[PDB]
Amino acid sequence: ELSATAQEIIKSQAIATKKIISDYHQQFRYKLQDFSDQLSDYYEKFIA
């Protein structure tokens, strides 16, 4: 029973962990895209 409980806990934890890892990886990529796009018209905004 203890082995089964440990197995179910570790399975429930690993999937949630991988879900969160995918989430913040996607957020990191999105923020990279946002910053790369933003670093386009700095000169134009400055001059204007």
Name the maximum alpha-carbon separation found in the chain: 71
Report the alpha-carbon distance of residue 18 to residue 24 in Å, rounded.
10
**Resolution, angstroms, 1 dp:** 9.0
Give how far Cα 41 sits from Cα of 25, 33, 34, 35, 36, Å.
Answer: 27, 15, 13, 12, 11
Torsion of CA 28, 30, 34, 35, to 10 degrees: 20
User: What is the rounded CA–CA span in Å between residue 32 and residue 27?
Assistant: 9
Residue 40: what are its φ and ψ, rounded to 5°? -120, -55
